[PDB]
Amino acid sequence: GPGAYISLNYHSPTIGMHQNLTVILPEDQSFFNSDTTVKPLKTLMLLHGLSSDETTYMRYTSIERYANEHKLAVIMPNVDHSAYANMAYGHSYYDYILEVYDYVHQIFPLSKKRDDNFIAGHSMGGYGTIKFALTQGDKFAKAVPLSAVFEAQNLMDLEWNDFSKEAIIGNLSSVKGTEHDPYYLLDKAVAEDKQIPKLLIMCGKQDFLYQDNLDFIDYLSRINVPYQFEDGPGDHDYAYWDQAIKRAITWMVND
Amino acid sequence: GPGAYISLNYHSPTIGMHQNLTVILPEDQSFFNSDTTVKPLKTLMLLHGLSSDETTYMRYTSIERYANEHKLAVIMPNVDHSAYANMAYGHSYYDYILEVYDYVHQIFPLSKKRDDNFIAGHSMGGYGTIKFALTQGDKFAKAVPLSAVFEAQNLMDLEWNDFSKEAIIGNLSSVKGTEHDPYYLLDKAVAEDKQIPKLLIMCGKQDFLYQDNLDFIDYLSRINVPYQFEDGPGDHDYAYWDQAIKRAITWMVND
Amino acid sequence: GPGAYISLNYHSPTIGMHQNLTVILPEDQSFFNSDTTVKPLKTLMLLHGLSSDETTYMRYTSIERYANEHKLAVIMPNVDHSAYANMAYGHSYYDYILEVYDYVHQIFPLSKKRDDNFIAGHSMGGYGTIKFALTQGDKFAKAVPLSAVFEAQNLMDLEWNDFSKEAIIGNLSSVKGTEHDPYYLLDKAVAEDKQIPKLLIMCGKQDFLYQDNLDFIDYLSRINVPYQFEDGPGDHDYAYWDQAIKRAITWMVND
Amino acid sequence: GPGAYISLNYHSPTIGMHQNLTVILPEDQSFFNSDTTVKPLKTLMLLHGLSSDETTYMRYTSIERYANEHKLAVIMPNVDHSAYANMAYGHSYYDYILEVYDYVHQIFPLSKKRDDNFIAGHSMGGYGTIKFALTQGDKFAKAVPLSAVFEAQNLMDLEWNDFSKEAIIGNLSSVKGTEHDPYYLLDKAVAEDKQIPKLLIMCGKQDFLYQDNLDFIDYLSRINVPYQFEDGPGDHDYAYWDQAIKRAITWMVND
């Protein structure tokens, strides 16, 4: 089963600039028959890590092959070094992901039902995934952080090439207890009885963030929030993310 | 002002291969608001000439700027050296254009009303435009051949690099009186009382097809088919088609 | 080390039209220092199968990841339904591959040494690979047919979607003894003592072309031409070609 | 004149992320002769304005047609909302432009002589053009600011969609006397007997930056810096920049 690979570049009203976006749209027989109603596809929002962009999942994995097999549309935006935040000094990249979600669901044949919408991503994108899962729980039925950063201070303190902590968080001395802290977002969601998407958290056992993942699922267990955790051999690279996204895609479309 | 520039590559069931396609999709406020119904856009099917492809209108004109002013969606397929024919030895490129039409109208917010759908193209694409206008009149309200080939044997006998006459028409010596002949298609459309689209025919006065164009509008006049004809200085190049397509787009979107 | 992914569209003098080409160019520190001459890279010409195009290796495999690991440049042209032949009724796609080879070696930092240049491909592209291996042996030190068609009459008689046998071979009754026959090309290469590139032949055991590959390597054995043959589980799909190409790239650069 | 349109995406060591870049590469015979030495092309570094990106010159002008006509290679990078600065809280985008210059001169057949290299851009890109002209005068023989901002404080105090002045300049209350201020860069270039490329300054008379351009040219004569200023009807839009780059390209190439 094949599909369409789509590169879109549009002027975003939220971030004030042209920006590239890539979309995988699997083929359906209704797309070629003008007398049939388009039946909308299940949709995955997929978020890249630091130093990656909207092209890197396509280049370094076989994701389109996996998505085609499962009739899953995949949306891959670009957010730079933003950590998926409305940046103190930068762009409103949190709001941007929400605009991308609304835009593709308006212009493409994508289901708008919560049960048909998922979010996933790796490293900074796993951090982004858990932030959206805990603040936009009504938009996604399932969320898949891969090799995620859950202790936000480890992301902000990283000395990554050309990376600016202050652009994201400004003057802030710590992120604990703020909108940047997944532990705070999680306590907030439980306290307000928000829907939390079904969680499949994956991380390779040789990954440097492996302890970070253990600490977070340990906290989830202690506050009685369900999840699936899958580890096994793997490091912090696209060889691991290629295999994990294949497993994640199978899990999201099947129950 | 702003819009989306879209590159699509999908596996076409009609031509049995992956093929690239370009789409210009102007922005509409309904595209960014999940609570409003999408307002479908007026749509232009735009056909390239021989040796061009799906990228060349973008590269050699400012078509996206003009389309954006008038909120006109533009579909630009690729058909190789086919002359928009179901080839004797090749691909079913006539059927391909009908497939592209149904496909983009299924997956994008494009109006399906006849009054909102137009077709245009230059040289071999003007030849294609008049063929679809005279055989698919129920799909297009307006048609704009630019520097078109109306006497088909000029194209079939043209001595262009790597161009194969026989791939298109096979062993046929002449194209007159066949599906490849716009005069025949025209006589059959009038004889069968088919709806024929509103016609704007343009061609520069220094173009080698100028006299070819004069012959065709003279025949249109003798069989009581209306048209508007625009000439003036210009040759067979993108300096002319950049100008001509800007004027054509204003004519299409305005009653 | 991540490198560059490059999409090129240029007007080909050989096939008389614009055509898309994709290139993977791994990073070399000399690319960032204007005062040095570029260290020319090893280069692989990679040929797609029928119904694929210049984007399908990127989309359905992780080839860029594998190429980056081995600092291997990769050239991926598009040749439609041509079977890499100068078509009886169509385009001169055999000559086209030679033009692509000359073009990318002129404009990119690619080694022009025979020992640094390789060719590979699957199905129709493995058939193309073996023809180029046996007719351009001075240009390639290694050749890797994957799931190749070696008995050409099976591809010509294949009834694939919109596939035209006469477009390639015209009025020929059979392909035995012609330029289209790899067995003839092999006998001719041995008879004239042409250099034959180092051969790695791969085919999945569940592939319908498996017996066709066994027949060909048996003939190679009987005329004392060396080769390495790799089978194992796998069918005729990109799941198989994703890791045949990963093994092939390791084999090509490590001699 | 036909040519190559090239999209490149590479992981930049300077800005720590994958980034897209577009390149226009006109044809020369030597690109198709394996036996001739490639003749290096004249090269234009072309800088977009605020809210544009690496695709917008190709989409909203006919620049490739003009460049092909004069055998001019054109490099179009993306620098987001950076104003071509090494940002206080962001990316090292000044250094990035220098990396791009070195990179494309290593991997493409581009002349490294000063007399063959030019720089141009509009609005924020005209501001960028004058900054590189006055700090990298040895890399460029000619520079063309189009509708530029010379009084840098107009750009920093601008109230544009999602635009962050503090990302660029930090706490600075004024830009005067700093690297962001073109008037200081000009006095320092004159003071240090630094080479100033030949200057063609263009601005439409209805452009809101027109008085800002008049002020700069009045200062240029006042201190003996030669220039040509070209005005005429035009506003701050791509309709004007389409003229102006067409005229600008003819001026730089012909000598």
Ligand SMILES: *C(=O)N1CCCC[C@@H]1c1ccccc1
């Ligand atoms: C993930 O996107 N991050 C970017 C570089 C590699 C992993 C890294 C990270 C490491 C440690 C803490 C947070 C982020």
Ligand SMILES: *C(=O)N1CCCC[C@@H]1c1ccccc1
């Ligand atoms: C138009 O598509 N054609 C391609 C090459 C230039 C003009 C040419 C044509 C010339 C004369 C008759 C038919 C086509």
Ligand SMILES: *C(=O)N1CCCC[C@@H]1c1ccccc1
């Ligand atoms: C390979 O490119 N061919 C295209 C379709 C799938 C395999 C097919 C082929 C099958 C049998 C004989 C020849 C070709």
Ligand SMILES: *C(=O)N1CCCC[C@@H]1c1ccccc1
């Ligand atoms: C140019 O790129 N700038 C972005 C918005 C429109 C013009 C604008 C600018 C205006 C005035 C001063 C500096 C920049």
